[PDB]
Write a structure and sequence with these properties.
4 copies of one chain form a homotetramer. With 258 residues, chain A is of the alpha/beta class. Chain A has helices at residues 20-31, 43-52, 70-84, 107-127, 129-135, 157-177, 195-198, 202-209, 220-231; strands at 11-14, 35-40, 60-64, 89-92, 139-143, 183-189, 242-245. In chain A, α1 (20-31) packs across α9 (220-231), α3 packs parallel to α4 and α4 (107-127) runs parallel beside α6. At the A-B interface, α6, α9 and β7 of A face α5, α8 and β7 of B. The complex binds NADP nicotinamide-adenine-dinucleotide phosphate (4 copies), chloride ion (CL) (5 copies) and magnesium ion (2 copies). It is classed as oxidoreductase.
């Protein structure tokens, strides 16, 4: 009869919500009656996802914005407050994972990944702070990864760096946000079927599939539903923490051990 | 419209559900339409909680049983499988946290705590394996603690050991249970208002409250709602993992971090 | 021309010192001039290891003792203090890793593993508290494992629990021991070429090998040298902590 | 015989003119390791080079900014010229300015990320060929408990930068293993240093009571941990962390 208090009518931002995990998070929240502003740089991709999600209970709309731009963060929050009247949930999700061996990585390569993945998470949280404070039950959910905080994978030394940087930030942010009644937590997916992971190629997807006790790559709904849990009133006592959503992938001591 | 898939009508066991966190877990699942068998050693305590929860949607009944005894674990599962028609969720929750300095801990002190807190988790999971497998969506939630896996506290070196033992066990158990479609995860509460935590005294409670950025001890519902998430179909891809429910307690570097 | 302060003359116990990692810890400390008492249940294995190490700078001798028996812990400490005049280092190392699936493990199976691997670590620490306190620079090094604290491996759910139990114990113990100037820390070996690990077969041994970035199983000296570092005076500010010694094995997002 | 002598080997210590980097430099020098220390302030580099003039291994200085890849390349070339090669890199330079979340500007974040994380990556990249040629390369990163483990108001960007170093090295260790280079990190708790003294006596008098060991750490505690990682005997340790903090991260309640 009753599980979690309904989030209907609340207001959320998902950065990088046009594709992949961000889209699955937006759809998960929208199905729960949360109005969602999704962001991204490509307008056509935002428009297709807004069109695709037009039948959801919560209204998904788009704001074209680069997470690396602090001005775009402020505009995103202001536009979301304008459309919804306030702001309750920020899902700091936008992220990229280009691959490059450490000896090949340029300053620009490193700043590209750290700017989107880490700086872009900090910028949207900063911009959203006052509206989340006015919420009285603010929720920030960060899309980190097992890569960095837990795992290594050749080619992703800067990616993993940026995923760990998110968590180092939120362990302090959680303490600064607690008097404002905002929780901040992070989902750490393992390997989820997305357009972004598709670019890694089939042999990467097979490789990770065989390393996962659950026997499959995860789904965007898996991450959206973890985000949803963190946003509930029922999770008000959870802050500064991580949840690994990976089918057991970080557990095995070795390969065939699965 | 829709948040998670209703768990209405599923079957659960909560060990040590007559008091404290286990009762909060039982009530949380009961309010979700889950039928719950709570266990414990004191029949009066079980009867009173069953009566306290008489008005919940799901049906909360009791089974008097000692987690340290594997035969009781088998009896608990069978009674549950007869009353509910199956078994979908096992909350390995029963535990004790008496306090003793390392130089005072007897073999009995250590075995009492390891047996209740760790052996009693293993035995209930072993007893439930077959019914959980037949459910096709089996869920095990372990009540661990920040104490042991993360923190230390003088007098709890055997308690901390048992809480971390639960986690070492489940990181392998999650792999063995994956082909059976059973996930196993732990909630790691920080400090939660319970009858057991009351026996630590007012100085302990004041000390811990001031250590918590959220500014309060947690409630039993906080832990119940975390166990509820793990038990959802929507958490099928989460196994072998932990969730710390502590108001931020384990974060501060020191006491101006807080102050 | 100076790295760490010589441990020459100090007094150590290594539980389970006749074979495998314990013997490597014992030899590493003896090479550093530490007098070492090794323990084990089999007198022949103790006698043979004492004879093998009879040329080391530190004197290695043996006490036949079961780590699961608290009286044997006490007798071990008393005998070491009688032989050396004190006790500075305790290497709580003794352990077993039989395998069994979750649904096959009997109460006696579980207790055997928890008894040796966890209780035996607690009992030697307890028995040594007094003498370690009197040393003024006491050191406890626990041989834990990546299995349990970090990894899972089917058939070792009770092994993994026992190894993680060591760490939960030591995080509190480090706080109770700090006023006594005793530090307590753990080495978490990955996969180390030993007698006990050879009881897993060549299939298990080749399996972990390709899963390790360093390209090899570790050596008992790798673990002994970690323990040696924790025992230095220079590590007096390290306590309640862990060091994974595994050639990178816990790192890969997949071992392919 | 404790560990194999490192006498005659070659090391870089970034930010080695003060505090922890100076303790690392003096610890390696006392072991007979020739050490190039970097920094931006020549006056502080000259003063430290002179203070350590009696050490067995020779401490010399190269003025360089960790945030500049070209300064990283120059540091490694100058070091290979002076010593004949390079065996050990201690990526240690770091800053910890304090600022509340809502006040951190983009420049504040880039300054801390640039020094603490980018500066670690750049000196490792620059050293890769020389470290590979040594056949026993050693990278030691100075991270922190702050970020990887703890939070402290005002240090959200600093903690991010210290956790960034570890996410980097967990992958870097796998890429470096075929080159026979290990890479680990020391995570100091609270260590008596010059930069740490900028936090004031209130911050000083207050982290001491929360540490089970009962004191702040010393730069030698960090140097000796870095020395362990650099030994031949630690060849099978890579991608890993060592917390040096007197038990500070352990207490459930610091009171
Ligand atoms: N897929 C996995 O297995 C996995 C696992 C662990 C963690 N993650 C994390 O999940 C997050 C998204 O992963 P994904 O697989 O879903 O990626 P994806 O499928 O490639 O989608 C990324 C989204 O982020 C947006 N984006 C990219 N750069 C942006 C920028 N500078 N500003 C604003 N938006 C930007 C993209 O829109 P535009 O390109 O049009 O801007 C797109 O909507 C990342 O943080 C990633 O690290 C993914
Ligand atoms: N309260 C906290 O802050 C906190 C924090 C972290 C973790 N935890 C964990 O949460 C669990 C319960 O904590 P709590 O505060 O709720 O304790 P509690 O209030 O004392 O409740 C303990 C429950 O377990 C039962 N129990 C005790 N021994 C048992 C046994 N041998 N067999 C079966 N049932 C037994 C008790 O009933 P009977 O005595 O009648 O049998 C009681 O119902 C423990 O595992 C504890 O480690 C608690
Ligand atoms: N080998 C690995 O890859 C690995 C990896 C991680 C951790 N570890 C840990 O390292 C420790 C030992 O490993 P190992 O490979 O060296 O094992 P091993 O080769 O089988 O030797 C174990 C030693 O402990 C002794 N022992 C066993 N049971 C005892 C008891 N009840 N009382 C006293 N001594 C006892 C044995 O002598 P007796 O039988 O005669 O008593 C033997 O000397 C264990 O704690 C293990 O968990 C090993
Ligand atoms: N002190 C602690 O309690 C503590 C705890 C955990 C971790 N750590 C870490 O240990 C490292 C050193 O800390 P510390 O307390 O020893 O700081 P410190 O006493 O202030 O010394 C910092 C050193 O880094 C150098 N440096 C600063 N900015 C630089 C730049 N842009 N390029 C090159 N060198 C630069 C400084 O020289 P110049 O100014 O001349 O450049 C100085 O030699 C840091 O990475 C810190 O995060 C410290
Ligand atoms: Cl992290
Ligand atoms: Cl654990
Ligand atoms: Cl652990
Ligand atoms: Cl096994
Ligand atoms: Cl990290
Ligand atoms: Mg795109
Ligand atoms: Mg001698």
């Amino acid at each position: 009869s009753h599980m979690f208090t309904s989030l209907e009518g609340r207001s959320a931002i998902v950065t990088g919500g046009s594709k992949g995990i961000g889209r699955g998070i937006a759809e998960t929240f929208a199905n729960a009656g949360v109005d969602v502003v999704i962001t991204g740089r490509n307008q056509d991709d935002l428009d297709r996802t807004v069109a695709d999600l037009s039948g959801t209970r919560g209204k998904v709309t788009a704001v074209r914005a680069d997470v690396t731009d602090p001005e775009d963060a402020r505009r995103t929050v202001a536009e979301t407050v304008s459309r919804h009247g306030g702001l309750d949930i920020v899902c700091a999700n936008a992220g990229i994972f280009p691959s490059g061996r450490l000896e090949d990585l340029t300053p620009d390569d490193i700043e590209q990944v750290l700017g989107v993945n880490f700086k872009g998470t900090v910028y949207i949280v900063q911009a959203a702070l006052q509206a989340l404070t006015a919420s009285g039950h603010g929720r920030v959910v960060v899309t980190s990864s097992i890569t960095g905080p837990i795992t290594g994978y050749p080619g992703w030394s800067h990616y993993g760096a940026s995923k760990a940087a998110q968590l180092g930030f939120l362990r302090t942010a959680a303490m600064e946000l607690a008097p404002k009644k905002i929780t901040i937590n992070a989902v750490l997916p393992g390997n989820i079927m997305t357009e972004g992971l598709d670019e890694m190629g089939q042999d990467y997807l097979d490789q990770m599939a065989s390393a996962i006790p659950a026997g499959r790559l995860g789904s965007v709904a898996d991450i959206g539903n973890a985000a949803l849990f963190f946003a509930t009133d029922e999770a008000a006592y959870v802050t500064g923490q991580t949840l690994v959503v990976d089918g057991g992938q970080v557990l095995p001591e070795s390969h065939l051990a699965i």
